[PDB]
Amino acid sequence: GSELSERIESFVETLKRGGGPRSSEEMARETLGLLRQIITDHRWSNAGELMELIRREGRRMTAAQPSETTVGNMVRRVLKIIREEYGRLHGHYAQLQSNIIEAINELLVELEGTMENIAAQALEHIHSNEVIMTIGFSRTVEAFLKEAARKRKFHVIVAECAPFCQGHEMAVNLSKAGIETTVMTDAAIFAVMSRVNKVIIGTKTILANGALRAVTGTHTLALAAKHHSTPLIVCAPMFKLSPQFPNEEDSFHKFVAPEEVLPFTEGDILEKVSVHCPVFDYVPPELITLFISNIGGNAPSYIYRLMSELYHPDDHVL
């Protein structure tokens, strides 16, 4: 009853104010648990009313934070699960609900295996004495690299992300496992690119065009890789896949307080200058060489088929 309502609220405000939970895998787990509790703790008999209330609460979620697309695309995954179950039972009400629940359960148990799947897949993409470059921080990519390091020796060049220098803690984490790690400013990306073999980077969201929304500055790294023709690898699980297209959407970049870019102590100039701090940026699919997912490697030119396999095309608007 009101527990469900206040938990939905709590989650909405946690998504709105700050980043909670930090890992987007934990965010997917939390939103899936909440969707399960909603579909269990409501008086819905027909699948249509359930889908409608799910779409409404998902609209509220998406309005809470548009840049966090995992919640929305997993809501769409739940909607596709409901559609599949209704087609199975109609192409049956209690069995409907329990079958939806076991579908969500299998989705959740395969959710925690994507990390291990990518880690296992990592070995056949790294050779000895290779030079990797990565930008920012990504749990999936550091797991990739520290799993490849157990049987291979290679160098990782971590380009810090300004202003949020998450790349520093990533470099430290990689050095923990003895992965020879060079830390540099993002300004030195093109200067060092000539000596890099591969580029491995995570992402926040993959669009239907194949493009991906990743931390700012990664588009420049992709342009450098394309200039030097080095393969650019994206190790992104299959819950960051978003059916929306690049310019049919709104609110792509996430702008945070310019205090991160230019501090308050600069004084009077802060009334004359316009400071901008875009967290995310757009990378076209032409600059991506290969996508690594929990199922296996795939070219950017197959992400649309993955969409068709994951999301109903009438649910791309929620």
Partner: protein
């Protein structure tokens, strides 16, 4: 004959009508009129209609329609044709909603305050621009004059009624104006397997300049234009469709996205659709 004049008057019937839709209408009425009740004899009359209709008109769109919907009807013995006419009627309905779906999926890709750059007159581009301006979007438009048949002037006249600033440009001036165009939208006359488009003569220049300036190159086309051809160079295209050529080929290397009734598609997806359809 009987199909030649009906196709001609269908062109006369609706000057605001495409040629592939007229072709499917003519073939539907041809199959519904002669009453050919034969398992194998029906296909003879069909291909006779198709060869006649693309002999009168040298469009790749007409031939592609012909092929795809003749397969569709053949994929449907007395009850065979009885259900085949049903499936043809619903095919016509889907092909009618084609262009509205195309406008209402692609009108959202034009960021307002931008500058559209378009080749010769095309109904799909006009429809999507009408949908965009109906959504309260202001933008400038450059149109190529289409020297062989001055369809650029016709496009400019048609778009001036839509209350938008249109500046028809010279055929060879796209290289000059390409830096002033935020994007390029062209209506394909036919879509080859790999994703390329066999469109009017200057569309390839458009795409090459787009790649010379990284400008997005957008294409809008109906799915009945999906033809199963694979040209490697300009000469590899069928010569019948070229007739001083009239229609040339553009590689999918130069195309960003395709806006069809099947949704927005990567140039890679059209081959998926075609091999799922199995020619």
């Amino acid at each position: 004959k009987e199909l030649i004049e009906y196709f001609k008057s269908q062109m006369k019937e609706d000057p605001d009508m495409a040629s592939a839709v007229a072709a499917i209408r003519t073939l539907l009425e041809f199959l519904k009129r002669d009453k050919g009740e034969t398992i194998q004899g029906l296909r003879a009359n069909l291909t006779s209609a198709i060869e006649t209709l693309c002999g009168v008109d040298s469009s790749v769109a007409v031939s592609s329609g012909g092929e795809l919907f003749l397969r569709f009807i053949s994929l449907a013995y007395s009850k065979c044709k009885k259900i085949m006419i049903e499936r043809g009627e619903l095919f016509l309905r889907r092909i009618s909603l084609s262009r509205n779906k195309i406008a209402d999926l692609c009108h959202t890709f034009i960021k307002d305050g931008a500058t559209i750059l378009t080749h010769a007159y095309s109904r799909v581009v006009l429809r999507v621009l009408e949908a965009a301006v109906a959504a309260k979007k202001r933008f400038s438009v450059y149109v190529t004059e289409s020297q062989p048949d001055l369809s650029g002037k016709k496009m400019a006249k048609a778009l001036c009624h839509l209350n938008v600033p249109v500046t028809v440009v010279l055929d060879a001036a796209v290289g000059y104006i390409m830096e002033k165009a935020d994007l390029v939208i062209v209506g394909a006359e036919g879509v080859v397997e790999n994703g390329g488009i066999i469109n009017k003569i200057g569309t390839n220049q458009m795409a090459v300049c787009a790649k010379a300036q990284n400008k997005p190159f957008y294409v809008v086309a109906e799915s009945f234009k999906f033809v199963r051809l694979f040209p490697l160079n300009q000469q590899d295209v069928p010569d019948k469709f070229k007739y001083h050529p009239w229609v040339d080929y553009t590689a999918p290397s130069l195309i960003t996205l395709l806006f069809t009734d099947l949704g927005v598609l990567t140039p890679s997806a059209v081959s998926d659709e075609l091999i799922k359809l199995y020619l």
